């Protein structure tokens, strides 16, 4: 007969926040904020949110609580030809889960290695360090060399990641068993949180969504007490209005807020599917989004206080210390900064554990959307038991992550994360944004919102759904396709054919939507206008 619901408004309410907040919120926003105008970057970051992020978040969050269907079956009730979207996302997920969990595997390998009284990345006297390794509490006057490296950089480079054993994308095998065990433990800890459905995913979230704020608070006070921490805050908030004249920083902010809210994937759809019908969507979306951003904002301080202390301990010019723009900012710089502090074991454990808890809920939701859709598309053909399908997805994701668990894995993380998944999710999100507003009709949508909330949404939101949001995604997609960024990681420049590979992985994800449009269009009899009429009209 019917489906299930939420145990309490909060669990989903948090749960969606647990989905939105992640690692990107922690390290990605502070960097892009600092190098693009500093505090001035706060101006275009909000404009791209209010006009572009919020309407997509709310528009995505409403349909899920209205139709109460998955990512696939909701198209059968709107535009069946676009039903392939629901499949595409699935395929997309399979790629996403291939690298998103390996980062948590790194953080976990760091966590289990943070139970020793003396932290590994502090000394150079190890079995993975080289002759270049030079640490502190050593001879003074030391001068850095082009070939010299830090014990933290060695620890990340040559131990956990073990990237020195690979020459790049060409030769990256073999596979590391340690990170395999870690990612197995993680694939187990996400299993016991989803297998019981939305009951546990709203209960486990309680721990995974609240801990990062406590950790950020501790690291915030700690970083605030650190000497010379005002340099990172200064560099982090120093107004550079000239940056606003560049047409690039606006695109950067747009992509940033779009990715942070992560609408148009069906996760919000699935989370909204299990909720009250007369329940509000406006306040929910608004509050959640404002948290995701604010959280990023304070995370900026948490990062740049410690990086300010790091620049103070070195020689200023914070940008120098924050030259790297990736996990190295957390696994090397921030880690090495933690190692030189009292109770370093504590601040390390809470940090890596913070990372794990930061990714876990996002994984919960990420898989949750796909599982919900598939079960809703194949009902009771599926849903006979949930642990069977969930496990079947988890294992497949594990075998799909073996490519990432290799020695040359981070390369594949960059390649898949930037050249494959990102334009594809933006693309399918564009197809959704166009499909809901121009095919199903924005008027009928406002009528549905008028049914649920009791009142029709304002002109401000309608005008955003009609033209502002599709052009919002359009600007990002066009900007990327017109000029794909040159990839670089760990003193290694990517080959020219890399973009060929990523696109190849990108295009091969949505192959189901045009061929599915052709499927319906080749299945439905009569004239093409009649088939398209049955493909545009919702199901009698």
């Amino acid at each position, epitope marked *: 007969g019917e489906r299930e619901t939420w145990g309490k408004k909060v669990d989903f309410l948090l749960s969606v926040i647990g989905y939105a907040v992640d690692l990107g919120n922690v390290w990605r926003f502070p960097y892009i904020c600092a190098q693009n105008g500093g505090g001035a970057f706060l101006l275009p970051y909000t404009i791209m949110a209010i006009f572009g992020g919020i309407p997509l978040f709310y528009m995505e969050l409403a349909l899920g609580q209205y139709h109460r269907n998955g990512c696939i079956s909701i198209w059968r009730k709107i535009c069946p030809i676009f039903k392939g979207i629901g499949y595409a996302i699935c395929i997309i997920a399979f790629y996403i889960a291939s690298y998103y969990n390996t980062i948590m595997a790194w953080a976990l390998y760091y966590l289990i290695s943070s139970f020793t009284d003396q932290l590994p990345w502090t000394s150079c006297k190890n079995s993975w360090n080289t002759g270049n390794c030079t640490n502190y509490f050593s001879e003074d*006057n030391i*001068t*850095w*060399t*082009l*070939h*010299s490296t830090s014990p933290a950089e060695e620890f990340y480079t040559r131990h956990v990641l073990q990237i020195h054993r690979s020459k790049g994308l060409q030769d990256l095998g073999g596979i590391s068993w340690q990170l395999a065990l870690c990612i197995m433990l993680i694939f187990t800890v996400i299993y016991f949180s989803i297998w019981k459905g939305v009951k546990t995913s709203g209960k486990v979230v309680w721990v995974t969504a609240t801990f990062p704020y406590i950790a950020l608070s501790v690291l915030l006070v700690r970083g605030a007490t650190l000497p*010379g921490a005002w*340099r990172g805050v200064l560099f982090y908030l120093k107004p550079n209005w000239q940056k606003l004249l560049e047409t690039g920083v606006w695109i950067d902010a747009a992509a940033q807020i779009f990715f942070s809210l992560g609408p148009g994937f069906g996760v919000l759809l699935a989370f909204a599917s299990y909720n009250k019908f007369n329940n509000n969507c406006y306040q929910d979306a608004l509050v959640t989004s404002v948290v995701n951003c604010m959280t990023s904002f304070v995370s900026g301080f948490v990062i740049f206080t410690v990086l300010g202390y790091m620049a*103070e301990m*070195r*020689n*200023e*010019d914070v*940008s*120098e210390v924050a030259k790297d723009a990736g996990p190295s900012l957390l696994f090397i710089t921030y880690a090495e900064a933690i190692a030189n502090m009292p109770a370093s074991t504590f601040f390390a454990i809470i940090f890596f554990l913070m990372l794990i808890t930061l990714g876990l809920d996002s994984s919960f939701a990420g898989l949750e959307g796909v599982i919900t859709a598939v079960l809703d598309e194949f009902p009771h053909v599926w849903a006979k038991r949930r642990e069977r399908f969930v496990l079947a997805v988890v294992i497949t994701c594990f075998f799909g992550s073996l490519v990432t668990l290799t020695f040359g894995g981070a390369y594949v993380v960059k390649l898949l994360e930037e050249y494959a998944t990102g334009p594809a999710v933006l693309t399918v999100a564009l197809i959704e944004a166009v499909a809901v507003s121009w095919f199903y009709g924005i008027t009928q949508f406002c009528r549905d919102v008028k049914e649920m909330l009791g009142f029709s949404p304002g002109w401000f939101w309608r005008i955003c759904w009609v033209a502002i949001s599709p052009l919002f995604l359009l600007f990002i997609i066009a900007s990327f396709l017109m000029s794909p960024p040159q990839l670089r990681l760990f003193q290694y420049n990517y080959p020219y054919w890399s973009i060929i590979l990523g696109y190849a992985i990108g295009t091969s994800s949505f192959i189901c939507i045009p061929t599915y449009i052709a499927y319906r269009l080749i299945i439905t009899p009569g004239t093409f206008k009649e088939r398209i009429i049955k493909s545009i009209t919702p199901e009698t």
Partner: antibody
Amino acid sequence: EVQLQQSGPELVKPGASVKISCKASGYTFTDYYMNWVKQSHGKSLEWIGNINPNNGGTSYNQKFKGKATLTVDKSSTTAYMELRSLTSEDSAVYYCTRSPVRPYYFDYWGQGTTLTVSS
Amino acid sequence: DIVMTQSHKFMSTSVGDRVSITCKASQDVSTAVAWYQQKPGQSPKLLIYSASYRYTGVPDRFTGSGSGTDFTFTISSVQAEDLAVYYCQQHYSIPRTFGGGTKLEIKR
């Protein structure tokens, strides 16, 4: 015995180009950044830019972007700086100095190169 | 960028007198300031790095001090061969900038 031997004086007509060399010795060439400093007659020192000998990692100044071109040769451990669109302002003394990664000081300098841009 | 300002273009001193040159920066620099010596007709020679530290092959009569924006280069015993132009240079932010230069003339 760290020695940096540059090239001799160069007299060139305005609008043309000029290349200056920099032979390094007495140290591991692939260990340190190679830099070039412009000094006008009676004026102060002016950091043009550096280059990483390992891969030719160049890093220029905004004031010299599109004015100077730095190259390097590991086979003979020699750095090069090329100047195009020469004017009377370019008539100055140029140095090539070695520098580590951190702290970024200029420990060893070349003897200098007197450039004269005139017809 | 960063502007290293040297107010005194010229300074007079006698053999054996205590002389000190000041270096003013744009923003805070903390530790990183280097002092170079350039004799007339020669290339600049590194004397001081990181505010106070001395480089190898430098006499004990050359000292450095300061922490922030204002820095001080101190010579206790001025010799006849200490006649040169002294520069101060920051080394934290890109690009690296120098100072005006103080031509230390000797009074006798």
